[PDB]
Amino acid sequence: SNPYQRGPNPTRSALTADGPFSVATYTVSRLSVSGFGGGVIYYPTGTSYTFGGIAMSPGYTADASSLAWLGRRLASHGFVVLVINTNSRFDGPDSRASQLSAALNYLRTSSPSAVRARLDANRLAVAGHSMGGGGTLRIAEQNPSLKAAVPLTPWHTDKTFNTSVPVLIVGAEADTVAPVSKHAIPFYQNLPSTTPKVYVELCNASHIAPNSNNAAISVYTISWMKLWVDNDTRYRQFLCNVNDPALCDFRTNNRHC
Ligand SMILES: [Cl-]
Ligand SMILES: [Cl-]
């Protein structure tokens, strides 16, 4: 049952470190693509399976290296992951959405054959930090064929996204760049009631929490992508009946349980 299932039965512990797949990396040079600023593809190797794809945007004034740990972590659990560099480090959220859109098309159509051989382009998702998270919400509204969206410490001036794409937002309690009461929580609240949605808020963390290995980001991001990109119900356990001391808030419409 479930053609998209990959990897062993998950444990919490297993989801805080790199997963069972070996990872290869491919550098996409800035000048080799129009529509975004290149970046790095992390993707499984040593295997004949295909996997869903994820495009992920860094945040404000940031480079793709800021999310390298997470690009690798996701890929190691069975995903083809392109972490972009933006055309300019100063690009805003809706610009980042357009470049996510270009990056997804690049992964499907123009990436190396080794990468395309590992990709099922029918199952794609998006994630991003800060302003990249705002871009993630924008693209999920523009393109509802996406399987999932994970905005990390997101920032946007628009607060309402009418999307049917399942959304998990990570806020940071002590974020002063994108205070959750002004960004993350309004985004969560304003999503359609019918859309499966989860908000998790990290105790004591600030805006830079996504820029380094973080156990909670790892668990919630892997689990949401597995549940929606792979239809993998083994990962519902981490997302349902949650009682997680790393969190200082938790909200859900419980559509995914
Ligand atoms: Cl913009
Ligand atoms: Cl398409």
Numbering used by the authors: 2 to 258
What does the paper say about this structure?
Enzymatic degradation of PET using suitable hydrolases, like the leaf branch compost cutinase (LCC) variant ICCG, offers potential for PET recycling under relatively mild reaction conditions. Computer-aided enzyme engineering performed by Tournier et al. introduced an Ile at LCC position F243 to enhance the enzyme’s catalytic activity by further expanding the substrate-binding site. Additionally, thermostability was increased to 94 °C by disulfide bond formation between D238C and S283C in combination with mutation Y127G.
Among the seven glutamines (Q6, 100, 143, 183, 190, 238, and 260), which are located on the ICCGY surface, Q183 is not located at a crystal contact (no neighboring intermolecular amino acid residue within the range of <10 Å). Instead, two negative controls with Q→K exchanges at non-crystal contacts and without an interacting amino acid in range were introduced, which should not increase crystallizability. Mutant Q183K also crystallized in a lower amount with a mean crystal size similar to the WT (252.9 µm ± 97.2). The duration until the onset of crystallization was nearly doubled (48 h) compared to the WT, rendering it “inferior” to the WT. No interaction partner could be identified for the mutants T26E, Q183K, and Q238K within the standard range of electrostatic interactions (<4 Å), as intended for the selected negative controls. The consistent space group among the crystallized variants of this study (ICCGY and mutants T26E, T110E, Q183K, and Q238K), all crystallized in batches with identical conditions, emphasizes these assumptions.
